[PDB]
């Protein structure tokens, strides 16, 4: 069971800012992480798989990257539906374990 | 080899290079002429009009 | 185990990427489906030596 | 392309619970991995097993392995998460998911959400 | 979780006809077996045949066989019973019935039946 | 095929009396039997399978015993309930057949 540590557990950033959460890995993964969106009481929505790519209909604005235990998502401009919680989840081996979450407020 | 600049050669079950070195029991051509977009659908299991 | 992804220079002449006639990719992709028959499905062969 | 969830239900302790996820607009939905995830209450999700339509074939998380049983109706589309004993634990919110084949077993698709609380 | 069946027809003797039953309510639809049981007014059941949907496997009857033609679609599943020049003694009522796999070959549901009249 | 025997073909008995039906096996068929009744006008109804065990939904005074050629059906009370032609179908083997009836009257 991969362990997975998402950092900070909140994070608190003005409108416009660039965005960073780091993902952490118990055992190394070959860049077999996802990005979630979830706002509140919503679904999570696929924003990035393995950690480069991103799904359609996601803005150029959301990007990834990293690879092993470390990985890194950043907004390079912030956007009010931007503000909600993220996820990570690594797909490496099975027993897929989630991030604890980000909480995202201006 | 010498037809034509950019022939879209494609063989299943066989390669291109191998076809000299083998012996084929029944032989035949099946010539006819399509749109460009409609090449692709001459393969096995393809879907097209 | 050959990891080579050199271009095949089929021909004499050089094959250094054009991927024209006798120059071609040596690596070619399964692209299994579920749809493809038991023959064609994929199967995960491990060797004990 | 949409999974559909039973509609958020309310059940008191020790009653089977049975949650339907339905897909439509892609077709061989059969041939897709269908799983469900757990969201407790202010918690992380939790993945908790996934099934394969077509041969009814089930993996589990550790943690929720014999606790849920997940079946498949292929005839009708459909992927069930059974709950037996219903207890304070198992009040969260369910989101049945989608699996793409092959390397990529994040879920592409997510349903709406099915709240259970006990 | 009951069987419908279609409404009740009337025609001469020597005429071609086709009555139809669709199950509803239950899942896995196909793989139960769906069967037609023939009572003649004022007479004992008489089982008629068995279809399976999934598969469209028959075991008809030794006094049936070879004169009643029972098929199935699972797509909509419905089983039809398909009678080819109806004689004077095919004045009865047929019900659908569907019966579970294993062991337990009774018949648990009954359709309503239809008034077949020749 | 397996024949059945069904005794009697028509019994009269009050609202409150104790009946038994019997069934006969031409062929041991084990405890493959299943006691059905049919209102006249209406599909008939299972009510014993494996010869003693009760279709749920099935009032309770029903009961069902026996095995290989003799079979009974006893019912300790009667109600207009119980006033339909009942039927013995055996499953033991294929070629299924079923018992010519019981009349049960007021």
């Known amino acids: 069971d991969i362990q997975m540590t998402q950092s900070p557990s909140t994070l608190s950033a003005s409108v416009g800012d660039r965005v960073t959460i780091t993902c952490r890995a118990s055992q190394s993964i070959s860049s077999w992480l996802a990005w979630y969106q979830q706002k509140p009481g919503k679904a999570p929505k696929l924003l990035i798989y393995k950690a480069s790519s991103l799904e359609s209909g996601v803005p150029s604005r959301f990007s990834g990257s990293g690879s092993g235990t470390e990985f890194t998502l950043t907004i390079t401009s912030l956007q009010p539906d931007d503000f909600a919680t993220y996820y990570c989840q690594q797909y490496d081996s099975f027993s897929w374990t989630f991030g604890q979450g980000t909480k995202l407020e201006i | 080899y010498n037809l034509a600049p950019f022939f879209t050669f494609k063989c299943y079950g066989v390669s291109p290079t191998k076809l000299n070195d083998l012996c084929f029991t029944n032989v035949y051509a099946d010539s006819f002429v399509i749109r460009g977009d409609e090449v692709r659908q001459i393969a096995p299991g393809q879907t097209g009009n | 185990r050959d990891i080579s992804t050199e271009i095949y220079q089929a021909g004499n002449k050089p094959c250094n990427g054009v991927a024209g006639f006798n120059c071609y990719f040596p690596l070619r992709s399964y692209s299994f489906r579920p749809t493809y028959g038991v023959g064609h499905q994929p199967y995960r062969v491990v060797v004990l030596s | 392309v949409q999974l559909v969830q039973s509609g958020a239900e309310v059940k008191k302790p020790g009653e089977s619970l049975k949650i339907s996820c339905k897909g439509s607009?892609?077709?061989?939905?059969?041939?897709?991995?269908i799983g469900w995830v757990r969201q407790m209450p202010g918690k992380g999700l939790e993945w908790m097993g996934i099934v394969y339509p077509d041969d009814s074939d089930t993996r589990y998380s550790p943690s929720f392995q014999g606790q849920v049983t997940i079946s498949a109706d292929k005839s009708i589309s459909t992927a069930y998460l059974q709950w037996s004993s219903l207890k304070a634990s198992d009040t969260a919110m369910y989101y049945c998911?989608?699996?793409?084949?092959?390397?990529?077993?994040?879920?592409?698709?997510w349903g709406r959400g099915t709240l259970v609380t006990v | 979780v009951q069987l419908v069946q279609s409404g009740a027809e009337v025609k001469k003797p020597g005429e071609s006809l086709k009555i139809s039953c669709?199950?509803?309510?239950?899942?896995?639809?196909?793989?139960?077996?769906?069967?037609?049981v023939r009572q003649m007014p004022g007479k004992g059941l008489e089982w008629m045949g068995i279809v399976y949907p999934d598969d469209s496997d028959t075991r008809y009857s030794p006094s049936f066989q070879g004169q009643v033609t029972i098929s199935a679609d699972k797509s909509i599943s419905t089983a039809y019973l398909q009678w080819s020049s109806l004689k004077a003694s095919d004045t009865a009522m047929?019900?659908?019935?569907?019966?579970?796999?294993?062991?337990?070959?009774?018949?648990?549901?009954?359709?309503?039946g239809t008034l077949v009249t020749v | 095929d397996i024949q059945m025997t069904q005794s009697p073909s028509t019994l009269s008995a009050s609202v409150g009396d104790r009946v038994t039906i019997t069934c006969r096996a031409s062929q041991s068929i084990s405890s493959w039997l299943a006691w059905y009744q049919q209102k006249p006008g209406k599909a008939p109804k299972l009510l014993i399978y494996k010869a003693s065990s009760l279709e749920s939904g099935v009032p309770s005074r029903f009961s069902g015993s026996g095995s290989g050629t003799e079979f009974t059906l006893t019912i300790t009370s009667l109600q207009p309930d119980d006033f339909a032609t009942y039927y013995c179908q055996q499953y033991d083997s294929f070629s299924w057949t079923f018992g010519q009836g019981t009349k049960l009257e007021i």
């Open positions: 607009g892609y077709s061989f939905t059969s041939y897709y991995w």
């Open positions: 998911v989608r699996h793409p084949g092959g390397g990529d077993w994040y879920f592409d698709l």
